[PDB]
Write a protein that binds this ligand. Structure first.
Ligand code: A1EIE
Ligand code: A1EIE
Ligand code: A1EIE
Lengths: 1342, 139, 139
């Protein structure tokens, strides 16, 4: 009902008698409602609400890295609604989004959009009840659909009767159909019907049905071809059904659509060679014909070409699915084999290349790519001649990486047009401009070249030149002037030359360009035209929504359509800026900040805002325009395009801004001319902040602080400057903005860098320095959590290490002990103050490390540590308990005693925690028992009740406390965003989301042969969902746990970065929880299977398979020379296993769109994981350890025990960076490594290099972790262990991040590589010499 | 106080070092004109955008269009130069006479002889090196 | 008609920018595009361009850290073979041998001997064919 008014308040008193986030959920549920008017009211109310609660909404969006979950759900819902049929609803929902803002897909989270689609219900045959049922539903919806012809509804009910003839509903058949269909079909289900139409013979008329009078119209062509076919099929039941539905077919084409596929299947089963040739003729004709290619009266044809293409495609698709299912049957008789053979033969008759060309004609890009790769492989056809078509395709799809790959592959020199394609897809547009000029010289009669020239000009921002260029072109040719008018319009309105806008607009009444529409709106604003304004507003909103409509029906849709979403954002902002003029609550700053960080996103919004400000007449507009030009800088500077803001860095101009200087400095710094930047910056500082008068006020003090900090950083970079001056500058920055975090942070970093040098690397001397360091770090934290990941861990490491060294010196008998002791006391006091000031979650973030050092030797240090950990525990008992469990049950007694001390202190602080602690202890003990429960016999499945009674009971008791199901989402804390820093540090919610407590266990427990017989359990969550948790004996997971943490941090990074996001790079992460050193519980990842098993099944299906003994024969002695091994490999192992993985892709995903999306995801995921592994030195990537999700196609890695180049230590050393066997490559597609995969690798590598500091700090903490079983277990168990290769491991990790291979022999001085790094890595992985050496277990041949 | 004058001088002397030094000395922010001068003295890409902003600031000045056309020349964008001069002419007939030299140079470089002849015919007052070269080549 | 020349000058420009790797790839592709091993390039100027390209690839390799010493050495030797009388080949080969010697010999001249003989001989021949690097070579 969703009333919103006092009358609605009467209804609400009613609802109270019956019984912002709340209202939001309500409106959400509303919009989903079926009644269109219901939804419309919902949407209107929602739009108003959003406008009214804009403040709280923005706060939700920007307070924390990730948006409030409710927001994510709401945006998913709105984008869905975009798909709705009613135009009004679509427009309303577009307004919804635009009002929300253009949230960076990163900040949003889409797990709801599983989008299975309820599709792929391939029907094996007509006989199948479900298929005949769908046919009956078709006919019923048909007869009801139209009353225009009594004969037609009569034909549908007649087919109902004939279906009763084929099979009686009276009771499975009746059971099959629903009641809204049941009651509709019942009146004629039994009555009777005369033949709806007079008999006609499609076979009598002989002609290619396409291009025939009957085939003139699409539906009529559907009617003539299907009738002919029905005549053709030699199937009595098929003939019966076909005749039954014939009459209905004449009236509605859609019934024809449903029927044709199986009609063809039956025609294939019962075949005449001449009939087969005629069928292939019809299909080829439909495919061969290009509506633009052939000339005829197009009233029928225009629609006919497209529709017929789609129909033939669908028919072939059903044929393919039928053939695959029949091959599965055959493997699982002879008549079915013959039928399947006939169908496969007909399929073969069709040309893949033809299919691809047609598809491309029909804009069915994805299917085109699929067909084209299928062609390039199925029939081997060389490297070099089809590249043009494939490149054009990728261009269409807008997949840049496709174009880049295609280029990377082409051997022959690239044609000019191809270089144009490449520069457009990805290029600085400078080469683009010059190539355009050269094209104009090469071709003087093509408009598109001038298009590109003008577009480039605009990009650089040379408006006036663009206007004049358009005018010139106009002078040369009048006709082109119409097409080119758009860019002139854009320049004008951005130029703020309204009159020119009016002229050019009046000139053309045929341009639908976004730019032209924007100019129209701005004009209607300039000259107050309320009615026209709002009309154009509706129109443009609809237009924009159009593309997003199709975009919605896809995974990751939001991202794919983000451009249009930003357009809607601009529209909303424009509306709210204009309204007051006609007769502006929105907060522009926050809005902009929510947007993704890339040109495509920010720039257009900013230009539009400059325009609006121009239309607005406010005194401060002159300066606001400077802020907008300066806001364009740091939105482009970050991207590159350094000339793309000359008309910005200059444009800013008048508005007084030391900010102008700071910006010019950052720019120079990006460009590499550091000394320049320092000069310009010192000058701007002197000028804007003369020493005589202090800047004490607001933005002035702020900018002064920022400038001083930047000066300091520059000075650090330059080698000339003295340490002391740097330290002084940083201290000054701190003094001028004590509240700022960056100040203290950089100060601490610099002191840290200096300390090793000043102290000679002697801890004793370092003490005082360490105090200063930790103090400033903690302060920085207290202000903001931007650099938390680098700050916290470093501080903790330093303090704890100093404590350890002091304990050693006290035990030693060395004089420095007393000074060290006083220093340590001071340090501990500092830590205490930090504890008091810092919020709990901030410690939570390194809680892992904290726990790691629980066994520290010095008691005072331990007291402090315990205070910290206890504060945390109280703050977040669930996560803390999970993380501490293992240590609790450690075999080492000291670990257990200390953890118990901690828990006791906590309990003392908050009693209620005691009950929960006891419950958790009991639950963990029982789970450990289970994990270690010995299986008897095969015992594939064991009932919970039969064996694990105590567990079911314990969970059953109502007294038992709720235990949060361990899940990565609930373990990895989120953090407050920089934008919002007020009271966020105090009230920040670490784990905003849905918390599922353990409500019970499904009875059945699975035991898996592989993985050393690990039990698999399924917990039952409070929400009712079931989560499957594998229980693993004999594995130390601590390593895996911390690695998962690091992966989560990497995932955050990947999400924030534009380039990674657009590709949707992400590392699949599964929660891991160690019950104790030997046993831990690991979350299951469903729909996923190992590469080895999958390919093994494929091979067996192909009949080609290698026996284990065969392999043993192929195996050779390790001492054998490399030549013999390479031989064995190439000669036998590679031959035996041909590349088939692409087939797995094909079968798993039938639909072209799903196929393409999943293939892309596969490439991206494998790339990301390979890079990450090579950085972390992941090893043992053997078939089973790597996995692929059947649902998305992504790749997931497991068995992260082998880390930090432990593989080399193996008897058979691992000599490859990551697992890239020929099969995986084949998977990626014909392009192979080159293409998507390469670009993903490169992007991931770049990102990692950028965040090198935070990752490196975290990894440091990880490597020096004492709890981790770095070595073999000794005696079964100070409860501390030290990793001997720690320093070496950190050095190697750093180098790899640096990009310094250091492998080079005979010369150890090597400049870092950049992309050549990814290239050399790929080469190494691919090389056969290496692989052949690799151990058989890795199954390199596969 | 007098830095503008010294910069102008060094510009006249064709002494780039002078202008660079001036710029380095100035405390105040550089005006757009002085910026144009410095760009021109010390070698073109940045100067094109500066010229664009200039034109936007003052439309009537012809020197700015001169600079933009020259730049487009240096980069090798002949065709663009032709179209640009043509557009300017469309807007202002007068300017066409001063700008004809660039068009002629472009053409002659394009090898488009008809355009060379026609443009050279347009006006008979240019003595620019480029214009004489075009006359010779056409002959 | 100047494919080889094209790719070579291009590699040079690219290097100028700094993307050494993108240079090496394009250059190797060109080496395959023209003078493609199917038959030995003896065609005079063609042989010259072939040698120039080979030497360029060799110096590139030297720049990149991945490539092994032996391969670089072999490439320089190939350039030497291709053009016996071209100084550049000999000079660069000598330079690379010099740089390698200290590590190979562990900085023990005794072992350094034979390498020294090779190096000196190649310097000398380089001098016979030209005088571009005399100041580096002779001393
Ligand atoms: C018109 N006369 C001047 C001229 C013009 C072009 C050339 C030329 C052509 C090639 C060439 N480039 C590639 C290549 C390039 C880029 C990428 S990329 O991934 O960065 C992404 C940007 C695509 C990947 C591969 C592959 N094969 C090739 N044959 O190299 N130089 C030489 C002279
Ligand atoms: C209207 N346009 C917007 C706008 C306005 C002003 C600024 C601005 C002003 C200054 C500034 N520069 C210098 C300086 C010194 C030496 C050279 S140099 O020739 O040696 C070099 C080519 C190597 C160049 C410049 C000296 N004092 C200064 N105050 O820096 N940025 C930036 C954008
Ligand atoms: C020395 N360290 C020992 C060690 C060993 C294993 C792990 C481990 C395992 C998983 C994990 N595996 C799967 C999984 C695995 C295989 C297949 S399979 O079809 O190929 C067929 C072979 C069953 C299907 C699914 C799903 N979800 C998961 N979380 O995670 N960690 C960790 C440490």
């Amino acid at each position: 009902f969703l009333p919103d008014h006092p009358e609605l308040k009467k209804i609400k008193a009613v609802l109270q008698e019956y019984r912002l986030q709340t209202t939001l959920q309500l409106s959400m549920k509303a919009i989903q409602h079926e009644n269109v008017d219901v939804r419309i009211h919902a949407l209107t109310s929602l739009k108003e609400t959003l406008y009214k609660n804009q403040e709280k909404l923005i706060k939700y969006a920007t307070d924390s890295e990730t948006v409030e979950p409710i927001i994510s759900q709401l945006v998913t819902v709105l984008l869905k609604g975009c798909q709705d049929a009613n135009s009004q609803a679509r427009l309303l929902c577009g307004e919804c989004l635009g009002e929300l803002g253009a949230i960076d897909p990163g900040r949003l989270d889409f797990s709801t959009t599983e989008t299975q689609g309820k599709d792929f219900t391939f029907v094996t045959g007509v006989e199948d009840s479900s298929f005949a049922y769908g046919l009956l539903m078709e006919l019923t919806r048909a007869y009801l659909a139209y009353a225009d012809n009594s004969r037609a509804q009569d034909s549908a009910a007649y087919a109902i009767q004939e279906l009763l003839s084929i099979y009686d509903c009276r009771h499975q058949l009746w059971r099959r159909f629903p009641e809204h269909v049941r009651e509709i079909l019942e009146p004629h289900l039994n009555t009777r019907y005369k033949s709806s139409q007079k008999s006609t013979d499609w076979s009598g008329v002989k002609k290619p049905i396409y291009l025939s009078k009957l085939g003139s119209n699409f539906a009529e062509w559907s009617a003539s071809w299907a009738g002919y076919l029905i005549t053709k099929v030699r199937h009595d039941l098929a003939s019966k059904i076909f005749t039954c539905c014939s009459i209905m077919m004449k009236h509605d084409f859609k019934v024809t659509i449903y029927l044709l596929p199986h009609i063809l299947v039956y025609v294939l089963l019962g075949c005449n060679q001449e009939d087969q040739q005629e069928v292939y003729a019809e299909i080829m004709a439909v495919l061969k014909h290009d509506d633009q290619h052939t000339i005829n009266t197009q009233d029928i044809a225009s629609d006919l070409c497209q529709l017929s293409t789609q129909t033939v495609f669908s028919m072939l698709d059903h044929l393919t699915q039928w053939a695959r299912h029949k091959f599965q049957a055959l493997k699982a008789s002879t008549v079915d084999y013959e039928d399947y053979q006939s169908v496969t033969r007909f399929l073969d008759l069709i040309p893949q290349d033809t299919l691809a060309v047609a598809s491309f004609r029909s804009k069915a890009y994805t299917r085109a790519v699929m067909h084209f790769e299928s062609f390039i492989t199925e029939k081997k056809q060389n490297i070099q001649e089809h590249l043009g078509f494939l490149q054009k395709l990728y261009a269409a799809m807008h997949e840049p990486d496709g174009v880049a790959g295609v280029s990377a592959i082409r051997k022959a020199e690239p044609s000019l047009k191809e270089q144009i394609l490449e520069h457009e897809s990805l290029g600085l547009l400078r080469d683009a401009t010059a190539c355009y000029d050269r094209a104009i010289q090469l071709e003087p009669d093509q408009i598109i070249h001038y298009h590109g020239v003008v577009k480039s000009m605009l990009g650089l921002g040379q408006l006036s030149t663009v206007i004049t260029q358009v005018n010139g072109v106009h002078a040369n040719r009048s006709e082109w002037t119409d097409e080119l008018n758009t860019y002139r319009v854009e320049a004008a309105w951005k130029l703020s030359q309204w009159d020119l806008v009016e002229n050019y607009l009046a000139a053309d009444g045929k341009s639908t360009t976004w730019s032209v529409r924007l100019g129209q709106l701005l004009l209607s604003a300039k000259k107050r035209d309320i009615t026209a304004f709002y009309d154009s507003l509706k129109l443009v909103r609809a237009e924009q929504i159009v593309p997003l409509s199709a975009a919605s029906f896809e995974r990751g849709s939001y991202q794919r359509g983000y451009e249009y979403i930003v357009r809607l954002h601009m529209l909303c902002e424009l509306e709210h800026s204009i309204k007051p003029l006609f007769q502006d609550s929105l907060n522009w700053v926050a809005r902009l900040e929510m947007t993704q960080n890339s040109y495509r996103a920010k720039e257009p919004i900013l230009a539009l805002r400059r325009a609006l400000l121009s239309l607005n007449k406010r005194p401060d507009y002159n300066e606001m325009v400077g802020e907008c030009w300066l806001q364009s800088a740091r939105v482009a500077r970050k991207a590159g395009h350094h000339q793309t803001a000359y008309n910005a860095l200059l444009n800013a101009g008048e508005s007084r801004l030391a900010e102008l200087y700071v910006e010019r400095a950052k720019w120079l710094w990006s460009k590499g001319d550091v000394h320049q930047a320092l000069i310009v910056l010192q000058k701007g500082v002197e000028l804007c902040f003369p020493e005589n008068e202090t800047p004490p006020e607001g933005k002035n003090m702020l900018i002064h602080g920022r400038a001083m900090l930047l000066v300091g950083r520059f000075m650090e970079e330059t080698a000339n400057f003295e340490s002391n001056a740097i330290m002084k500058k940083y201290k000054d920055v701190t003094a001028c903005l004590p509240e700022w975090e960056d100040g203290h942070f950089y100060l601490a970093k610099y002191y840290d860098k200096l300390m090793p040098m000043v102290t000679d690397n002697k801890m004793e001397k370092q003490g005082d320095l360490i105090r200063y360091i930790v103090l400033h770090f903690g302060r920085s934290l207290q202000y903001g959590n931007q650099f938390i990941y680098q700050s916290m861990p470093r501080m903790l490491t330093l303090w704890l290490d100093y404590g350890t060294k002091a304990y050693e010196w006290e035990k030693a008998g060395r004089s420095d002990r007393v000074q060290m002791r006083n220093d340590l006391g001071k340090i501990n006091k500092v830590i205490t103050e930090h504890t008091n000031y810092l919020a709990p979650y901030q410690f939570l973030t390194a809680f892992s490390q904290l726990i790691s050092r629980i066994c520290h030797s010095h008691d005072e240090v331990f007291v402090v540590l315990m205070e910290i950990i206890a504060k945390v525990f109280l703050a977040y008992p669930q996560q803390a308990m999970w993380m501490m469990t293992a240590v609790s049950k450690s075999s080492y007694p000291m670990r257990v005693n200390r953890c118990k001390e901690i828990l006791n202190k906590a309990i003392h602080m908050k009693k209620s925690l005691e009950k929960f602690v006891g419950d958790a202890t009991r639950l963990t003990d029982k789970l450990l028992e289970l994990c270690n429960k010995p299986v008897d016999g095969s015992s594939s499945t064991l009932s919970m009740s039969t064996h694990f009674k105590m567990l079911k009971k314990l969970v059953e008791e109502a007294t038992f406390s709720e235990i949060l199901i361990p899940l990565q989402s609930v373990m990895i804390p989120t953090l407050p965003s920089i934008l919002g820093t007020h009271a966020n540090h105090a009230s920040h919610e670490p784990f905003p989301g849905h918390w599922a407590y353990i409500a019970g266990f499904d009875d059945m427990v699975e035991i898996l042969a592989s993985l050393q017989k690990p039990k698999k359990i399924s917990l039952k969550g409070s929400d009712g969902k079931f989560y499957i948790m594998m229980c693993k004996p004999k594995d130390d997971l601590r390593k895996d746990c911390r690695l998962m943490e690091f992966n989560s941090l990497i995932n955050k990074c990947l999400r924030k970065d534009a380039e990674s996001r657009r590709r949707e790079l992400h590392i699949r992460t599964y929660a891991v929880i160690p019950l104790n050193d030997e046993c831990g519980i690991i979350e299951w990842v469903n729909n996923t299977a190992g590469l080895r098993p999958i390919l093994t099944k494929l091979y067996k299906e192909k009949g080609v398979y290698m026996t284990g003994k065969e392999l043993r024969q192929c195996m050779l002695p390790k001492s054998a020379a490399l030549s013999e091994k390479l031989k064995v490999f190439r000669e036998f192992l590679l031959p035996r296993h041909p590349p088939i993985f692409h087939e797995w892709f094909l079968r798993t995903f039938p639909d072209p769109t799903s196929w393409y999306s999943s293939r892309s995801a596969y490439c991206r995921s494998t790339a990301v994981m390979s890079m990450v592994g090579y950085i972390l030195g992941l090893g043992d990537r053997h078939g089973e350890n790597i996995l692929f999700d059947s649902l998305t196609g992504e790749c997931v890695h497991v068995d992260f025990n082998c880390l930090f180049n432990k593989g080399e230590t193996f008897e058979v050393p691992e000599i490859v960076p990551f697992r890239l066997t020929h099969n995986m490559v084949n998977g990626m597609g014909p392009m192979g490594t080159e293409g998507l995969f390469r670009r993903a690798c490169e992007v991931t590598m770049r990102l990692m290099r950028d965040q090198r500091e935070p990752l490196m700090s975290v990894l440091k903490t990880f490597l020096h972790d004492p709890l981790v079983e770095w070595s073999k277990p000794v005696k079964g168990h100070t409860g501390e262990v030290v990793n001997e290769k720690a320093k070496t491991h950190v050095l190697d990790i750093e180098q790899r991040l640096q990009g310094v291979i250091k492998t080079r022999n005979r010369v150890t001085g090597l400049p870092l590589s950049i992309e050549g790094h990814v290239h050399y890595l790929i080469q190494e992985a691919t090389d056969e010499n290496l692989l052949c050496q690799m151990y058989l277990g890795w199954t390199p041949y596969m």
